[PDB]
């Protein structure tokens, strides 16, 4: 890194700074007087203070990026959000007043819930005991669960089974499927858990 260890990461949060002094605790008061003496890294070009900033979508976009082509990866993401929203407006106008109440039209809410329905609680990791590697069903940390839900979704859309379908149409179709606890990616979650249940006897390795 070209930053010396002395450089601290920037905190990009308008609210954190407008917070009144009285509400602050003696611990939070010390952190604020300390940072005035610290070196701060330059804010990355990725994240800004914009009210429309979503760290999850920004992360999903980077996991779709091929060869540093952020423009294309970003274009695919926004095309997916537009495709999800249009599919819901078409389902909304074609529905009855009763069904309309249950139809979600926000693509950010669908995107987040679609991934949360794919996060695997438990995974298989080879813990070694006795000179052999046994795929032990191990709990998964929160970081790993969120990452696996993204990698599985991106991998499924890159599968060759889809013939000539553009990514914004594939991904939108998979997100709405997973949003309803349906799809191949949801099956991958279920099968991973079922495999982890068949190896419960191997938890001692």
């Amino acid at each position: 890194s070209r930053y010396s260890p002395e450089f601290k990461d920037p905190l990009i949060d308008k609210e954190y700074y407008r917070k009144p002094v009285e509400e602050l605790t003696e611990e939070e008061k010390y952190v604020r007087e300390l940072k005035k003496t610290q070196l701060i890294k330059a804010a990355p070009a990725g994240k800004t203070s914009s009210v429309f900033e979503d760290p999850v979508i920004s992360k999903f976009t980077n996991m779709m990026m091929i060869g540093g082509n952020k423009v294309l990866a970003r274009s695919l993401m926004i095309q997916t959000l537009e495709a999800v929203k249009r599919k819901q407006f078409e389902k909304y106008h074609a529905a009855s007043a009763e069904e309309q109440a249950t139809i979600e039209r926000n693509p950010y809410t669908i995107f987040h819930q679609a991934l949360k329905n794919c996060e695997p609680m438990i995974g298989l990791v080879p813990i070694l005991k006795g000179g052999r590697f046994y795929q032990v069903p191990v709990p998964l940390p929160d970081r790993r669960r969120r990452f696996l839900a993204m990698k599985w979704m991106i991998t499924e859309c890159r599968d060759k089974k889809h013939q000539r379908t553009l990514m914004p149409e594939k991904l939108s179709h998979k997100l709405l499927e997973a949003f309803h606890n349906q799809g191949p990616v949801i099956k991958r979650k279920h099968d991973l858990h079922k495999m982890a249940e068949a190896n419960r006897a191997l938890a001692h390795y």
Partner: peptide, 10 residues
Amino acid sequence: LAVADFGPRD
């Protein structure tokens, strides 16, 4: 393991 969702069993 008990909390986890194993999907519609079959």
